[PDB]
Amino acid sequence: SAGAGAMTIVNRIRTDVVNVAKSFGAEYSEAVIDQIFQGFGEKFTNTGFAIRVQNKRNQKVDCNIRYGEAKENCLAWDIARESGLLSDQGHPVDTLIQEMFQAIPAIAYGADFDINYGLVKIWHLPKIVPVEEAFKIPSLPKSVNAHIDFFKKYHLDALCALTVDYRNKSTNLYFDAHHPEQRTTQFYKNILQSQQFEVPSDEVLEILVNCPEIAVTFNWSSPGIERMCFYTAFVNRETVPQHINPVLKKFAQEAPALLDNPGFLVGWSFGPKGTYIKIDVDYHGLVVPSFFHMHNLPLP
């Protein structure tokens, strides 16, 4: 009743988020959750909302909640500012999402929150554009321009999203992984070895060949790529590769969703740290179809 029986969608979401966190042992703050939901709870109920767990080595699972919607303006910024979730840090991140929306028209935006912290990222989603359109953005890390030849070499020509991480002080460029070389396990070996990142098992490599989206993370403190991530979606619980990792298995089987038959998005992250898995449940069933659609792929 307070947390069960008839209840608003938003209260159902809150309860489910806390349940996930408790089940996976993630930390959270009641004050932060409340602050997030006061500002964003209506968005979570009506748009493409997801709950994520991720499993960094030698630390607790983290639980994040996120959403995206097809609006051309960055509606999250005002909401986060007014909620007390986004204070200036005296840093390039402070104006970066604003610069992104000035430089490249968006067809959607989103935001992401760690329930033990607050707002972590805001996302900008344009139509797919040449990656060179990003070089207009004043406050991007210098490392981005320096990787022009790397992007060309690995067929990272088609930019499909941008994000600003206010917590980590980093930015990600996301690419539509359209090129047939990206359907080969050798591509993933090569791109990882180019950054001296560890190469995963053959089993994981055979999963990566279906990845429609590649993120690359840059920061202002170093000249190199901080980490990269390969995203793969699965249309239901059973098709998630549960045997690869116990968090994948548990989350596919037990993650809550309002829709009876949800899909999932899995991010395989690699770094030098940086190597872990992220898994999101498609809580209302809107995210996975949208993901395939944004990458010009038929729905599997």
**Residue 227: beta bridge partners?**
217
State yes or no: 227 annotated in a binding site.
yes
Q: How far is CA 88 from CA 8, 102, 262, in A?
A: 34, 19, 37
Q: Which is nearer to ligand DMA, 104 or 215 (CB)?
A: 215
State the minimum distance, in angstroms, from the CB of residue 278 to ligand DMA. Answer: 6
State yes or no: 231 annotated in a binding site.
yes
- The contact set with ligand DMA (CB under 6 A) reads 112, 121, 163, 165, 172, 213, 215, 217, 229, 231, 265, 267, 278
Q: Which is nearer to ligand DMA, 30 or 299 (CB)?
A: 299
State yes or no: 52 annotated in a binding site.
yes
Q: Which is nearer to ligand DMA, 45 or 217 (CB)?
A: 217
State the minimum distance, in angstroms, from the CB of residue 7 to ligand DMA. Answer: 27
State yes or no: 57 annotated in a binding site.
no
Q: Which is nearer to ligand DMA, 15 or 117 (CB)?
A: 117
State the minimum distance, in angstroms, from the CB of residue 46 to ligand DMA. Answer: 18
State yes or no: 278 annotated in a binding site.
yes
Annotated binding-site residues for dimethylallyl diphosphate read 52, 66, 121, 172, 174, 227, 231, 278
* Residue list for the binding site: 52, 66, 121, 172, 174, 227, 231, 278
